[PDB]
UniProtKB/Swiss-Prot annotation, chain C:
The biological function of streptavidin is not known. Forms a strong non-covalent specific complex with biotin (one molecule of biotin per subunit of streptavidin). Homotetramer. This is Streptavidin. Coiled coil: none annotated. A motif (Cell attachment site) lies at residues 44-46. It comes from Streptomyces avidinii. Residues 1-120 form the Avidin-like domain. Belongs to the avidin/streptavidin family. Keywords: Biotin, Secreted, Signal. It is found in: Secreted.
Length: 119, 119, 120, 120
């Protein structure tokens, strides 16, 4: 149930394929929906989750460089998939920007996001 | 630079390869260091970093399932590689465990890890 | 504005008074709602926020010890109050438990809470 | 409780705290510069009856970055544990939230870690 298209609250889309070996691969698209707004995503997920109502643990990374732009940063999302009619991926995220050593204390933003199969 | 064998403060080993396409691929070997403790890692990095002294942003994910055990959890690391002599990768991490909706609020741990090429 | 009784999505109640000197003081009441689940809270907030439509930064702590029990843990919430129609405080939080050295890598939980003056 | 006194981080900041019998933490945070313009009030909570099995003492505290001389419209919360001994330390994780507009709330909060010791 993870393979497919997921949308967040702020306009982004990510298309992902969950491979049988635990791999997540796809593309993350920023609000602009532009070719310049498409980035590669890669991650991992628990390919044999509990069937007791627990979610399916997963994570993925996007580095914010493509052929058109580079923000010298990477985001990682860590969270869980929950299936059913109200299916959702609930995540918390870390965004790290390349900095000098003196500025390393403010290198990393933290936040959360929920994705759904419909907008 | 990034490609090689790295060690965290606690005794774990991260064997990584950085591809020209921005990809990170490798294997994580927990403190014990036997086969049952090896897990697949995948991630992404900024393959064209700034030239002004800043680090190179990167992230990766490990899902804690292999052929021998499954913890129904995944860790994502978010940070930056700082080169020179005494190369290091400084990270913050998020470990999420699959949980029921009732326990979702305690699903994610956070910490920090620093990796070096010297055990 | 910030002073009052606020509720999170999971049933808890936050009773707070915002002092003129930037002090936050109050009581946190867990979902159960009985006296065994009342805890003291203390914090700080920006008492002179920007006038450009930014939120008001704030934070507070609750150690999870009262006269009835002691979880050997403490939670800090960091966030901003956003005024308006349906006023809210958006926060992220860190809960650290006391642990030994060998287990300090799993001491700290991270999460997020949204509070409103209207109870779910 | 071992906690009262002066604590230093590696980046050059100092904090002076008093640990109250009731679980109160009160004090002053002094940034690297060292002058009055770099002094701010701190308040928090700690576990006043920690376990005796060698586990750390959970605590947290908040500073809002406003004094009489300046206002950065932000606040930090530190969540951690005190570990006693000859080389006592407070190990923490922190969140720094800045007040922002709603359109920028997604980049409102930084996370990091810091360790404080009794010797500079």
């Amino acid at each position: 149930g993870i393979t497919g298209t997921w949308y967040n609250q702020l306009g982004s889309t990510f298309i992902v394929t969950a491979g049988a070996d635990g791999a997540l691969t796809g593309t993350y698209i920023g609000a602009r929906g532009n070719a310049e707004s498409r980035y590669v995503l890669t991650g991992r997920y628990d390919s044999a989750p509990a069937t007791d109502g627990s979610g399916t643990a997963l994570g993925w990374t996007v580095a914010w460089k493509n052929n058109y732009r580079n923000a010298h940063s990477a985001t990682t999302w860590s969270g869980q998939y929950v299936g059913g009619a109200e299916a959702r991926i609930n995540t918390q995220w870390l965004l790290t920007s390349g900095t000098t050593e003196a500025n390393a204390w403010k290198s990393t933003l933290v936040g959360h996001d929920t994705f759904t199969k419909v907008k």
